[PDB]
């Protein structure tokens, strides 16, 4: 028969020498291997996936044995094999066992493993021929832009409260015009938001960062506040949503770091330190937040000036600074200054003691006095004058 | 009082704007600065020195502060300053600390002199021309004596490369070779094996200086006689008769070091073995191979119209000129060497359009006639010019 199979440049680009060797090994050893989960959703949406999860009927012991006998190196129910300088993370199909005191049972039933997954658009498998295995209407849901739980929203949320944030993230990722949400899902989120207080800051921060750099971040942050999710994920309860609205417009299209956008919710430095206590963020992330909150009102472009970028250049010359300044320029919506700053090479002071000796000066004190005069001119020019102009200038002084 | 100070054109020639600026700086900052080492020996021998070693009581930290404070550029216990388009390498006086390498800075000139190797290299010269000599180096220099500060055995064992230094400086200062201090020869012979622990790069630097310096014949003989040869990458069974002939052949004609060395090599494998030990440059290796391969067969066309022709043919058929000129030096062909060095490689002087003119229009016929002329031109030793070749071909037609 003829049947529908996926074909695209995004799918084709996955078939590296490693992947071809892996798929041939599993065929040879009579174990089914398929792409699973988020990679499938990405492929169906026309995007090459990264960090693919592969799924198999082989148990972890069978995979170990097979890789061992085939001379294939393993790294790290999941086994990671390395073939042709590429890693492949492969997980045995499983069913969760209900316990009072976490346990799974391996299975070869693809439909049972699909039923374990959260959202219908993430519950699908793809064969390497392009056959789609879809047990929960995920394909139709994806096409209709519906973000829906496998089974009942309340039950799936109460199994892992982080799925509240996943709902938001995938909604941003697939929806075109935001606004339509299933009321049973919103009800489930609002009633169970408090469950997020029991989830690690690390897990939350991973998802929140994806929401912040993803599409429809304005809609989603508003919904997070509107459903009272915000307090349980380390966000201040009384944020300036007006500032967030301005800043989200400012950074749109300019690849903000997640903390850049999050800082528009912070009134004071203490909100960064409170967020850190909850979400356990990296030093770089915290310092970025403090930098923006500290400098957003005062470190601003010069107006009626020869170089509007001069205050920012000063801050950089006087002292990681460039990254922080560029984020600030995004935050402030200074689109016509952002790229200039990204492309600005920090110039050293271009005049040396020797340059002054060459114009006839011999005294150390006099050389230092002249260099100081030249540093001031150089800084005054917005760090733009070069050696000859500066030396020309000093010869006049003399 | 009146005292003896050095005065010569060679000493005066050092006093550039740079050197004057440098000396004034050290006086103003109250640090003694003197010329040291080999530059002093050269000056005492009547020659302007090239890569002068300056010595000072100032520490390296003091010199960096002095130069920075004065806006003077430093380059890369030694500090190098650039003033008035010239570099000056200045080293703080030091003493070596015995360890199971470390030094201590000193302001005692005599202690730094005692660290130096040979008495003729252990002196200092003030910029007024005062000589500071703690180990009889001036007397040894005038008497042509190459003598260690302290005992030869102990100094050689601190740095076995000092064996080659002894040879080098013996060739440099002695006029009639033959008198060697027996304690020094004994120290060399007993410790020659220690050169096996010295890197080939360091050895090759010194060996090259010996090969292009005076009295190379005596020195290579002494290297073999004292059994230093096997430890510095030379073959044990060399043809010293060939060496004697070639050292006489190249004398006065500035041989490259490998040109003279190749006279010790019986076959190409000796070049390859020297290279394994001494890690020589590709051009140095290829010169050795060229000489060994060609010395017997690439020879002048005796009793011919152009004796140089074999060599010219080699160059035309394909660094070849440099290699051939070294071969001519090797071979003692003094009456051919300069002619080759001044020979411009001539292009074949006739083109197809010359054959066309008074031609001949067929491309095929043009190429046949040009071939005939290339042949006459080569036959003539590449000296016939366009007009002579065209007259020749007109006759042929
Ligand atoms: Cl690898
Ligand atoms: Cl958790
Ligand atoms: Cl507000
Ligand atoms: Cl960190
Ligand atoms: Cl600077
Ligand atoms: Cl060494
Ligand atoms: Cl012999
Ligand atoms: Cl030609």
UniProtKB/Swiss-Prot annotation, chain B:
Q: Which gene encodes it?
A: TRNT1
Q: Which InterPro entries match?
A: Bact_CCA-adding_enz_type3_sf, NT_sf, PolA_pol_head_dom, PolyA_RNA-bd
| Binding-site residues, CTP | 38, 41, 116, 159, 162, 165, 168
Please state what the protein is called: CCA tRNA nucleotidyltransferase 1, mitochondrial
Result of altering residue 278 to S: In SIFD; uncertain significance
Q: Which UniProt keywords apply?
A: Acetylation, ATP-binding, Cytoplasm, Disease variant, Disulfide bond, Magnesium, Metal-binding, Mitochondrion, Nucleotide-binding, Nucleotidyltransferase, Nucleus, Phosphoprotein, Retinitis pigmentosa, RNA-binding, Transferase, Transit peptide, tRNA processing
**UniProt organism field:** Homo sapiens
Q: Name one Pfam family in it.
A: PolyA_pol_RNAbd
Please indicate which superkingdom the organism of origin belongs to: Eukaryota
């Amino acid at each position: 028969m003829f049947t529908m199979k996926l074909q695209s440049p995004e799918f084709q680009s996955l078939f590296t020498e490693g992947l071809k060797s892996l798929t041939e090994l599993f065929v040879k050893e009579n174990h089914e291997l398929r792409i699973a989960g988020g990679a499938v959703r990405d492929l169906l949406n026309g995007v090459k996936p990264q960090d693919i999860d592969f799924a198999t009927t082989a148990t972890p012991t069978q995979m170990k044995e097979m890789f061992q006998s085939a001379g294939i190196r393993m790294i790290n129910g999941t086994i990671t094999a390395r073939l042709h300088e590429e890693n492949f993370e492969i997980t045995t199909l499983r069913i969760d066992v209900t316990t009072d005191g976490a346990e799974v049972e391996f299975t070869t039933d693809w439909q049972k493993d699909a039923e374990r997954r959260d959202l219908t658009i993430n519950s699908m498998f793809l064969g390497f021929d392009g056959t789609l295995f879809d047990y929960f209407n995920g394909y139709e849901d994806l096409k209709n832009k519906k973000v829906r739980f496998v089974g009942h929203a309340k039950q799936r949320i109460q199994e892992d409260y982080l799925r509240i944030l996943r709902y938001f993230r995938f909604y941003g990722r697939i929806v075109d015009k935001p606004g339509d949400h299933d009321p049973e899902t919103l009800e489930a989120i609002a009633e169970n938001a408090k469950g997020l207080a029991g989830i690690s800051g690390e897990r939350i921060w991973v998802e929140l960062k994806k929401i912040l750099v993803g599409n429809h971040v304005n809609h989603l942050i508003h919904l997070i506040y509107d459903l009272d999710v915000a307090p349980y994920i380390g966000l201040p309860a009384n944020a300036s949503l007006e500032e967030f609205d301005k800043v989200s417009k400012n950074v749109d299209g300019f690849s903000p770091k997640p903390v850049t956008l999050l800082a528009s919710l912070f009134k004071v430095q203490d909100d960064v330190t409170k967020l850190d206590l909850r979400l356990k963020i990296a030093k770089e992330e915290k310092n970025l937040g403090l930098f923006i909150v500290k400098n957003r009102k005062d470190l601003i472009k010069a107006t009626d000036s020869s170089d509007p970028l001069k205050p920012y250049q000063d801050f950089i010359i006087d002292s990681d600074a460039t990254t922080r300044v560029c984020e600030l320029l995004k935050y402030q919506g200074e689109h016509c200054l952002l790229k200039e700053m990204q492309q600005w090479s920090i110039p050293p002071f271009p005049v040396s003691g020797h340059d002054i000796r060459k114009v006839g000066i011999s005294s150390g004190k006099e050389i230092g006095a002249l260099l100081q005069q030249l540093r001031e001119q150089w800084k005054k020019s917005g760090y733009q004058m070069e050696k000859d102009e500066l030396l020309s200038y000093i010869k006049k002084t003399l």
